[PDB]
Ligand binder design. Sequence first.
Ligand SMILES: Cc1cc2nc3c(=O)[nH]c(=O)nc-3n(C[C@H](O)[C@H](O)[C@H](O)COP(=O)(O)O)c2cc1C
Length: 147
Amino acid sequence: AKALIVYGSTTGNTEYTAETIARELADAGYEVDSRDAASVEAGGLFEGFDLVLLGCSTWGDDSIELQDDFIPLFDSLEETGAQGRKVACFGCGDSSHEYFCGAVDAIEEKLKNLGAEIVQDGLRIDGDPRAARDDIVGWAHDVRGAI
Ligand SMILES: Cc1cc2nc3c(=O)[nH]c(=O)nc-3n(C[C@H](O)[C@H](O)[C@H](O)COP(=O)(O)O)c2cc1C
């Protein structure tokens, strides 16, 4: 009944993606809360939520880095209340890079170590998200059925 959507986005790709997802969940009857990573703090962030969706863009010149706003959260993921919590991940990227949506893997690896429960494989979007719109909607739909 309650979902938290936390996103880290620079050029607004991931932000558009997060809000598409939320419409999908709010439509199915969930109570939704969307938050910019810049605005939140890690201590008990997952408290009171049945499902969490975390999205981030991928950066870095010579190594894989997470979006700036997300870093603090990622760093203190141990304090969010992730053990046994149902999560799913997403992000925007560019397949011209070697590690296509490398942030997604990093987060997912981190969550499993914490004992989170990963409901579905992460959504990884190439180029412009409005052109992968049906894919976003498809995923939200799948996420829903995997609960
Ligand atoms: C210097 C740089 C490095 C990037 N590195 C990667 C990468 O390793 N893997 C990937 O999929 N995308 C990579 N991308 C691209 C972004 O993630 C992409 O432009 C994305 O749509 C931005 O998402 P946002 O608006 O949510 O910030 C990089 C972009 C730049 C400028």
